[PDB]
Design a protein around this ligand. Structure first.
Ligand SMILES: CCCCCCCCCCCCCCCCCC(=O)OC[C@H](COP(=O)([O-])OCC(O)COP(=O)([O-])OC[C@@H](COC(=O)CCCCCCCCCCCCCCCCC)OC(=O)CCCCCCCCCCCCCCCCC)OC(=O)CCCCCCCCCCCCCCCCC
Ligand SMILES: COC1=C(OC)C(=O)C(C/C=C(\C)CC/C=C(/C)CC/C=C(\C)CC/C=C(\C)CC/C=C(/C)CC/C=C(\C)CC/C=C(\C)CC/C=C(\C)CC/C=C(/C)CCC=C(C)C)=C(C)C1=O
Ligand SMILES: CCCCCCCCCCCCCCCCCC(=O)OC[C@H](COP(=O)([O-])OCC[N+](C)(C)C)OC(=O)CCCCCCCCCCCCCCCCC
Ligand SMILES: CCCCCCCCCCCCCCCCCC(=O)OC[C@H](COP(=O)([O-])OCC[N+](C)(C)C)OC(=O)CCCCCCCCCCCCCCCCC
Ligand SMILES: CCCCCCCCCCCCCCCCCC(=O)OC[C@H](COP(=O)([O-])OCC[N+](C)(C)C)OC(=O)CCCCCCCCCCCCCCCCC
Ligand SMILES: CCCCCCCCCCCCCCCCC[C@@H](O)O[C@H](CO[C@H](O)CCCCCCCCCCCCCCC)COP(=O)(O)OCC[N+](C)(C)C
Ligand SMILES: CCCCCCCC/C=C/CCCCCCCC(=O)OC[C@H](COP(=O)(O)OCCN)OC(=O)CCCCCCC/C=C/CCCCCCCC
Ligand SMILES: CCCCCCCC/C=C\CCCCCCCC(=O)OC[C@H](COP(=O)(O)OCCN)OC(=O)CCCCCCC/C=C/CCCCCCCC
Ligand SMILES: CCCCCCCC/C=C\CCCCCCCC(=O)OC[C@H](COP(=O)(O)OCCN)OC(=O)CCCCCCC/C=C\CCCCCCCC
Ligand SMILES: CCCCCCCC/C=C\CCCCCCCC(=O)OC[C@H](COP(=O)(O)OCCN)OC(=O)CCCCCCC/C=C\CCCCCCCC
Ligand SMILES: CN(C)C(=N)NC(=N)N
Ligand code: SF4
Ligand code: SF4
Ligand code: SF4
Lengths: 318, 115, 215, 144, 156, 176, 70, 170
């Protein structure tokens, strides 16, 4: 039955990734006064299927100068970690109920960083190398900021368990409690997922597709799937962490509906931001977190250490 | 057990997708098809040559600050102790030292990229 | 390359990502227009100017027509001159829309591109109604213009002009005070007035540097 | 309120003749609008107008399911319109062929032909001029 | 036959995705490239048809040779076409790309991009309207529909 | 006259300083951009449903070429080669000879549509309105040779589009 | 109009419903119609093991009570 | 032999199957491959030659190699390790039988193994490229055109002269 549960977690996530591709296309079109895909099927519903079939029936090539061993591993690692990030999320019952349900997320994200690095380096191309180093810098910045922000927010919670996050947010919302950390965390999630205005590793205007310049057909589709799965997963993480839904043990479907609605709202906000804003410059992104977010993040961490102690509201350990 | 099973499942699915991608479609590869891409012209040098890293100092500071976050992570359990005064004093000591390190680097221009 | 306008080879020497020297290689779109003009007549050479700067078509045509009329010692009629000025300003709007929107697209903003290109489509409709060609009109000729305006063109141009200030305001609501756009564009490519004059810059470059010069 | 718009959608479902016609128009034209029928030509193409729509979408055409000898249920071309309806659709005039028929000439084709490229009916170029130089023809009677 | 039926349905399935998922390379020359931009503009939105521009030739299916091809540019165009993986299609747009255009008798112009790359569709004009190029794209899609690769393989 | 685009200076009073600080901390202009994008989302798109809806055109439109006839059926062209002389791209080739009835009629009239720039000088220079640039523009071909028209192809185009061409010429001939 | 974006969003939402609902149903199915026992600590794990031992069927979710003591 | 050929590609694609199986270690087979451009030029010249109407031409290369030497040179130019081993003829035939069950283009067949093992005939009486006016291009000049694709990034840029010519049998 556990294998059935794993499949039920995996396959709908990939379906949601494909239809998120479609939704982003249409949302950007209507924000840009276009229509978006509406020809392939009824309201363009078959467009993701057409694109997937085309990509997996098209020829993939390996560059002559490429290191083939790490050329193949990078999409495998990216997709595997994108799917693995979904196992501890409670909706409202996690597939795997990890006691430290957040450090696993941090470690797997840091490991998923290396997929783009190894794809860029293995490609043996200058644009891929530039994209890889942009990934290095972006990872530095968002890693330190994410670590401190998450520490503070979970310090308001009591432990590193997401079901405990639900129980904490039973009455009110962490967005109400700690909205500055929430805004900085949203920016950090944008940077982590490489979405605009921080799409530096794959900046089309400055680089020709960045790290995946040499990737075509199936391997490229795996990078796209991993990116969109990470987008949805991080939006779900933000929704669980800051927008806590009410949970009824006897009818847990209501929590699932609320969680999915919040996740969709955050993902549509991601697409909205991409449509609205220009692109950063990676040195300006590094100076944005270190020189603006990091000082305020340290101050807010001190404040959120002191607040439960000074108000006699330290959360229960269990 | 379950975590190993799901890791195996994800890796197997990704590997199967790679196998399908590299064996289903028709392949016709020649020398120019697989050549490196440099916007239509041949590359002047090699991509394996040294590539200057203008933020080398910031990477080392990132290493040290990663240590700092490693130290700061067990705070949620440290708030359950009876010695709340000592715990708060030492936590604020660590955070103040981290802030002082950031301030020193910023004022000595360690955060400015090399020209 | 998306930012290289398709036909520019820019050989760059980078230390990391800092630029050490730029060596633009041009001529990938060299056609021998001047030689072909030498081989064509005066009327047969107008489309060559029509295709030189394909975002200011009637402006190129007006420049060529002014040169030919100056050599011929003739004078266009006042209605022809007014049509030339009106369509020159329409073409200036077209070119500025293209320039600003492609700049914002290279920087990472595309919705202004789409909006202003709908506006460009309307101005292309004006071009096509007056000439029969949507962009390469070949309408302004030595001595005046080829044909007179249709009997609804002025009203349609008035409607478009009335409903365009809001489009410009919507464009400015997205970029002018945006901190990301200011970070990308402020203090980038600074050229002094003396350097601009010596290098032979003209128009927007001089006026941005602060030189009060407009032909 | 949205109730009125839902009622309009259901009317469009009923206006097209039910679920079957609505689906057929949706899956072959990607739009389910209803408008006044301006006319229909000899090839089966129908033409509708709706002045309430903005300029550009206030005139449209539903293509026939079979033209000449081609099964045109799905693969609809933009060259299938005859010249008169082409002019009306592209808005070179506000007078439809039904109201203002064009002048009839004895040489104008009775049946319109779409783009025949890729078919054995495609145009093939050739020289339309005869041979410039005539070669000498030696006698058939031997001299000896 | 069962085999012929299976290969016919499979070929229809494969041709449908390629027909409805065209990803042209971001590649434009001279004046004809502006009409591609107006095609991508809201008025004649190409994205609704499944036509999406991509920058890398590896991730591109169609090359739209839109504008004049010069002698100094021909090697680069051939290089990017070669680096574009199969299946790949070519649409030449405008008189310059079709034949010589206004610059046919020029020392530095290639009289037709088909001297360099095999061209699948020719779009005539100077420049062809955005509607004309959209018609050319739809004609290319219809050309893709008639391909029978699995049917050729089965009867081979 | 002239005007300064960026020459203003901000007031340093406490209220303005606090407003700027709030804009910096609370991303007010970013929210404004989001609001503008949302407005455009809720607006109606300008996309037309091609090919079922066609973009507007004018009687002066230059499209595919055609050779016209008099109402009697006789060809209008008199082999005067004015179009060939004025053609900027040299895309027209003409060869003529006396016909069986002595008329001045062409035997070869070729137009290279891969060389033509669609500038419309040929229909301006024609003194009999024989060669015209019709309204058709959807004539893309799968092979190069199909775009090398000859007299038969151009006469076929004229016969095919005669009604629309005649209507457009009637509508626009008073401006010529 | 803008409401043609809804069907894609509706399909994506339906796809995202499946994981959580399926996990809840599988938890209830494999735990005797009750929530899966959460054992974050050795005490709770020992409770689960004792429940397995007392049940006599090697299933912790099979609960015994007063009718079992007497 | 050429870019899209079978010969050089077939011999250079045995990398994936560990070592190189050869019948009698390739010591009993002598082959003289001919260049594709030379073949095409001869075909074109035979059309323009008026006194080649009803004839039979043999197109062979200028050098004859043992199969072992030829495969060794192919692997040396491709910069791949060469590990040959003798495989009995019946076993090689069975291997070819296994590979020909592919509905697609087979990698190798029993007939292909037979042809590879067979030595190229000598037909002095028939005319050739020198009779048609074409000088046969030696393998050592155009081998790098085909076998450079089979190299890795380590040896991609190694020059043509870097590899000694194979030992001929004349
Ligand atoms: C938790 C994981 C634990 C893993 C085990 C423990 C690892 C401990 C740490 C590492 C210690 C070393 C272990 C590996 C020893 C490798 C020995 C060797 O010969 O290495 C050089 C050899 C040369 O590779 P290259 O330099 O890229 O190619 C140059 C050739 O000359 C090019 O020659 P060619 O082009 O003629 O030949 C092509 C051929 C050449 O392929 C190889 O040579 C690779 C063979 C070994 C693969 C790794 C085992 O490649 C292919 O055909 C591509 C498909 C096959 C490889 C697919 C990716 C690896 C699958 C396993 O392989 C490597 O360098 C391997 C790099 C990666 C290390 C192992 C990673 C294993 C990951 C498994 C899970 C994958 C999904 C993850 C998500
Ligand atoms: C001159 O030059 C030019 C320029 O200057 C160079 C320019 O600037 C421009 C201007 C250009 C622009 C302005 C364009 C930029 C602006 C835009 C708005 C473009 C936006 C672009 C995008 C948004 C692209 C992003 C989208 C992409 C890349 C598409 C990717 C699509 C996908 C589908 C991703 C792949 C997903 C996959 C593979 C998911 C697969 C899923 C599975 C495997 C799961 C399987 C599940 C199952 C099997 C379960 C099945 C279950 C059931 C019930 C089915 C059973 C039924 C049966 C019948 C079997 C122009 C025009 C130009 O010309
Ligand atoms: C024989 C197997 C060999 C596998 C080799 C490859 C994987 C190597 C790592 C070890 C195996 C996987 C983890 C096993 C854990 C066993 C214990 C367990 O289940 O604990 C439950 C715990 C439960 O969480 P908990 O510990 O917080 O709770 C305790 C238990 N309860 C809930 C009862 C209180 O699981 C975890 O904590 C999950 C941790 C996952 C860590 C994964 C580490 C490896 C990641 C990949 C490494 C390799 C990268 C390669 C990169 C690419 C190279 C080419
Ligand atoms: C949303 C999904 C995401 C993941 C998608 C993963 C891919 C799914 C693809 C499914 C369809 C695959 C169809 C075959 C594609 C062949 C590609 C190719 O190169 O073809 C040209 C080649 C052409 O071969 P050739 O013989 O012409 O080769 C000579 C080529 N030259 C001359 C250039 C050298 O065709 C083949 O090789 C034949 C392939 C036969 C089919 C292979 C198995 C396909 C099985 C599909 C599922 C079947 C289900 C049961 C039947 C159902 C019937 C209704
Ligand atoms: C279930 C396990 C799968 C493992 C991987 C197998 C490959 C397929 C992976 C899944 C994707 C399938 C997609 C559709 C089908 C296409 C792929 C496929 O099936 O290719 C088959 C390949 C296809 O050859 P191909 O190179 O033409 O593949 C391209 C296929 N098309 C044309 C469709 C693009 O065919 C064979 O392998 C036939 C021969 C089988 C026997 C030999 C196998 C190799 C040699 C091994 C033995 C070597 C020693 C010999 C002596 C032994 C005794 C001592
Ligand atoms: C996981 C492995 C891969 C999964 C693949 C199977 C899952 C997807 C199933 C197929 C997706 C839908 C395919 C059918 C699309 C129908 C859409 C409809 O519009 O197409 C019509 C008919 O579709 C095609 O013409 C027929 C080919 C597509 C169907 C192939 C037959 C079924 C193949 C097997 C399907 C199940 C797969 C089983 C084996 C895996 C004609 O469209 P077209 O004329 O172009 O458009 C012209 C433009 N218009 C609309 C404005 C006029
Ligand atoms: C506090 C740690 C250091 C302890 C003493 C070690 C001395 C020797 C080691 C030196 C390393 C310490 C470096 C950190 C301080 C040096 C930074 C510095 O020089 O400038 C400080 C910088 C200068 O800014 P500007 O001059 O305006 O910049 C102009 C740019 N154009 O301003 C600062 O002071 C920032 C420092 C912020 C954190 C400082 C940490 C100390 C604060 C202690 C407060 C808590 C005390 C606890 C009392 C509790 C009472 C109940
Ligand atoms: C409490 C109720 C009352 C509320 C009102 C109290 C508010 C006042 C409290 C003290 C205010 C502190 C003001 C000091 C900040 C101004 C310092 C300053 O301006 O430095 C200038 C200069 C400008 O930056 P540039 O690099 O030059 O920008 C590029 C220009 N081209 O800044 C610097 O050089 C950096 C200065 C060191 C940065 C320190 C940041 C790290 C410390 C913050 C972490 C959290 C606080 C730590 C604990 C605080 C308590 C000990
Ligand atoms: C099960 C065993 C799977 C391994 C099959 C070996 C595949 C192989 O040798 O390499 C093929 C291919 C790359 O070879 P190319 O030179 O690019 O082109 C070859 C096209 N036929 O490699 C792969 O497909 C990657 C292997 C799949 C994942 C392996 C597990 C990790
Ligand atoms: C160890 C077993 C390794 C598994 C095989 C790896 C599969 C990849 C092989 C491959 O992709 O190449 C097949 C390769 C070339 O085909 P393509 O690469 O598709 O076309 C491009 C030509 N440049 O096929 C061949 O031509 C090789 C011919 C095989 C003949 C030798 C077979 C002998 C078998 C070993 C004998 C041991 C039996 C005892
Ligand atoms: C201005 N021109 C000609 C472009 N091709 N521009 C562009 N942004 N691609
Ligand atoms: S065909 Fe005409 S519009 Fe196109 S590139 Fe050539 S001159 Fe410019
Ligand atoms: S439109 Fe201009 S280029 Fe074309 S045939 Fe007529 S005169 Fe020549
Ligand atoms: S200008 Fe008119 S009449 Fe004269 S040759 Fe040309 S088509 Fe004939």
């Amino acid at each position: 039955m556990f294998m059935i549960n794993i499949l039920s977690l995996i396959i709908p996530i990939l379906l949601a990734v494909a239809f998120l591709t479609l939704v982003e296309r249409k949302v950007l079109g209507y924000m840009q006064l276009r229509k978006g895909p509406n020809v392939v099927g009824p309201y363009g519903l078959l467009q993701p299927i057409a694109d997937a079939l085309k990509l997996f029936t098209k020829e993939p090539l390996r560059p002559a100068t490429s290191s083939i061993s790490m050329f193949i591993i990078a999409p495998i690692l990216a997709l595997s970690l994108a799917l693995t990030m979904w196992v501890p999320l409670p909706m409202p019952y996690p597939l795997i109920n990890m006691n430290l349900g957040v450090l696993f997320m941090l470690a797997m994200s840091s490991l998923a960083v290396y997929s783009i690095l190894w794809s860029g380096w293995a490609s043996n191309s200058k644009y891929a190398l530039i994209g890889a180093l942009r990934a290095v810098a972006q990872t530095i910045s968002y890693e330190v900021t994410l670590a401190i922000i998450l520490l503070s927010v979970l310090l308001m919670n009591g432990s590193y368990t997401l079901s405990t996050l639900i129980t904490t947010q039973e009455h009110i919302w962490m967005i109400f409690t700690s909205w500055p950390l929430a805004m900085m965390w949203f920016i950090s999630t944008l940077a982590e997922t490489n979405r605009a205005p921080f799409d530096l590793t794959e900046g089309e205007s400055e680089l020709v597709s960045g790290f995946n310049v040499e990737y075509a057909a199936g391997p490229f589709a795996m990078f796209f799937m991993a990116e969109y799965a990470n987008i949805i997963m991080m939006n779900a993480f933000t929704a669980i962490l800051f927008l806590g839904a009410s949970h009824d043990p006897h009818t847990p479907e209501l929590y699932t509906i609320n969680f999915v609605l919040k996740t969709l709202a955050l993902t549509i906000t991601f697409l909205w931001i991409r449509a609205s804003y220009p692109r950063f410059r990676y040195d300006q992104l590094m100076h944005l977190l270190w020189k603006s977010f990091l000082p305020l993040t340290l101050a807010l961490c001190m404040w959120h250490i002191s607040l439960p102690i000074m108000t006699a509201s330290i959360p229960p350990q269990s | 057990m379950n975590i190993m099973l799901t890791l195996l499942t994800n890796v197997t699915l990704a590997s199967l997708l790679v196998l399908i991608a590299f064996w289903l479609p028709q392949l016709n590869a020649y020398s120019e098809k697989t050549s490196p891409y440099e916007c239509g012209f041949d590359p002047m040098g090699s991509a394996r040559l040294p590539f200057s890293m203008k933020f080398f100092l910031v990477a080392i500071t990132f290493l040290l600050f990663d240590l700092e976050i490693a130290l700061l992570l067990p705070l949620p359990w440290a708030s359950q102790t009876n010695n709340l005064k000592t715990m708060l004093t030492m936590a604020l000591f660590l955070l103040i030292l981290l802030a002082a390190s950031l301030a020193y680097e910023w004022t000595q221009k360690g955060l400015e990229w090399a020209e | 390359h998306p930012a290289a306008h398709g036909v520019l080879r820019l050989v760059m020497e980078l230390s990391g990502e800092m630029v050490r020297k730029c060596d633009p290689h041009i001529g990938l779109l060299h056609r021998g227009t001047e030689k072909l003009i030498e081989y064509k007549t005066y009327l047969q050479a107008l489309p060559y100017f029509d295709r030189l700067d394909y975002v200011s078509m009637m402006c190129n045509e007006q420049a060529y027509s002014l040169a030919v009329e100056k050599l011929l010692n003739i004078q266009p009629p006042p209605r022809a001159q007014w049509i030339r000025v009106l369509f020159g300003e329409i073409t200036r709007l077209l070119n500025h829309i293209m320039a600003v929107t492609t700049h914002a697209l290279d920087i990472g903003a595309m919705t202004p591109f789409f909006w202003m290109f709908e506006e460009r489509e309307k101005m292309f409709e004006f071009y096509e109604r007056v000439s029969g060609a949507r962009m390469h009109a070949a309408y302004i000729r030595p001595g005046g213009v080829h044909q007179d305006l249709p009997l609804g063109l002025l009203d349609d141009i008035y409607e478009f002009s009335k409903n365009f200030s809001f489009r410009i305001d919507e464009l400015e609501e997205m970029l002018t005070n945006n901190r990301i756009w200011r970070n990308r564009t402020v203090d980038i490519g600074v050229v002094t007035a003396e350097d601009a004059l010596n290098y032979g810059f003209s128009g927007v470059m001089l006026r941005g540097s602060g030189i009060q010069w407009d032909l | 309120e949205l109730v009125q718009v839902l009622r309009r959608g259901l009317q469009q479902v009923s206006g097209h003749g039910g679920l079957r016609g609505y689906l057929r128009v949706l899956f072959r034209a990607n739009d389910v609008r209803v408008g006044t029928l301006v006319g229909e030509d000899k090839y089966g193409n129908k033409y509708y107008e709706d002045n309430k729509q903005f300029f550009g979408r206030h005139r449209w055409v539903i293509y026939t399911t079979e033209m000449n000898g081609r099964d045109t249920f799905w693969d609809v071309d933009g060259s299938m319109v005859p010249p008169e309806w082409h002019r009306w659709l592209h808005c070179m005039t506000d007078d439809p062929p039904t109201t203002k028929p064009p002048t009839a000439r004895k040489y104008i084709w009775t049946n319109h032909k779409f783009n025949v490229s890729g078919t054995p009916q495609q145009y093939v170029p050739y020289s339309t001029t005869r041979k410039k130089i005539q070669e000498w023809v030696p006698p058939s009677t031997p001299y000896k | 036959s069962r085999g012929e039926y299976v290969v016919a349905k499979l070929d229809d399935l494969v041709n449908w995705a390629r027909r409805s998922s065209l990803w042209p390379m971001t590649f434009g020359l001279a004046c004809c490239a502006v009409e591609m931009m107006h095609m991508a503009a809201p008025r004649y939105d190409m994205d609704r048809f499944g036509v999406v521009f991509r920058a890398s030739p590896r991730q591109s299916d169609v090359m739209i040779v839109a504008g004049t091809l010069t002698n100094k540019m021909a090697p680069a165009l051939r290089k990017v076409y070669d680096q574009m993986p199969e299946p790949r299609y070519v649409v030449s747009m405008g008189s310059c790309a079709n034949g010589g255009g206004y610059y046919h008798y020029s020392y530095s112009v290639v009289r037709g991009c088909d001297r360099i790359v095999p061209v699948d569709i020719y779009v005539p004009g100077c420049p062809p309207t955005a509607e004309a190029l959209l018609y050319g794209i739809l004609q290319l899609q219809r050309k893709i529909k008639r391909e029978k690769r699995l049917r050729i393989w089965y009867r081979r | 006259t002239y005007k300064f685009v960026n020459m203003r200076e901000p007031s340093m009073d406490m209220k303005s300083v606090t407003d700027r600080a709030a804009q910096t901390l609370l991303w007010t202009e970013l929210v404004r951009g989001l609001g503008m994008t949302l407005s455009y989302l809720f607006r109606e798109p300008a996309t037309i449903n091609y090919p079922f809806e066609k973009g507007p055109l004018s009687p002066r439109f230059r499209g595919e070429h055609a050779l016209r006839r008099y109402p009697s059926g006789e060809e209008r062209c008199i082999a005067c080669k004015l179009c060939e002389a004025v053609c900027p791209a040299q895309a027209i080739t003409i060869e003529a000879e006396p016909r069986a009835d002595g008329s001045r009629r062409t035997t070869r009239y070729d137009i290279d549509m891969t060389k033509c720039i669609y500038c419309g000088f040929c229909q301006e220079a024609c003194p009999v309105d024989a060669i015209v640039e019709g309204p058709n523009f959807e004539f893309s071909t799968e092979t190069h040779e199909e775009l090398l028209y000859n007299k038969e192809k151009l006469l076929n185009n004229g016969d095919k589009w005669e009604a629309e061409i005649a209507a457009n010429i009637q509508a626009d001939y008073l401006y010529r | 109009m803008w409401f043609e974006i809804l069907p894609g969003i509706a399909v994506m939402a339906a796809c995202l419903f499946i994981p959580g609902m399926a996990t809840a149903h599988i938890h209830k199915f494999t735990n005797g119609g009750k929530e899966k026992r959460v054992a974050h600590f050795s005490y709770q794990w020992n409770l689960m093991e004792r429940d397995r031992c007392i049940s006599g069927v090697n299933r912790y979710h099979v609960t015994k009570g007063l009718e079992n003591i007497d | 032999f050429g870019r899209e050929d079978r010969f050089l590609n077939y011999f250079a694609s045995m990398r994936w199957f560990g070592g190189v199986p050869l019948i009698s270690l390739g010591k009993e087979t002598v082959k003289q491959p001919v260049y594709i451009v030379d073949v095409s030029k001869g075909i074109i010249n035979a059309i323009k030659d008026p006194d080649a109407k009803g004839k039979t031409f043999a197109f062979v290369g200028p050098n004859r190699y043992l199969l072992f030497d030829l495969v060794q040179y192919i692997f040396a130019v491709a910069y791949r390790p060469f590990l040959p081993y003798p495989l009995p003829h019946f076993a090689y035939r069975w291997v070819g039988r296994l590979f020909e069950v592919s509905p697609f283009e087979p990698w190798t067949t029993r007939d292909k193994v037979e042809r590879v093992h067979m030595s190229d005939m000598t037909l002095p009486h028939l005319p050739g490229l020198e009779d048609l006016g074409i000088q046969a291009t030696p393998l050592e000049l155009k081998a790098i055109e085909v076998l450079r694709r089979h190299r890795t990034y380590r040896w991609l840029t190694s020059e043509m002269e870097d590899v000694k010519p194979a030992k001929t049998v004349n």
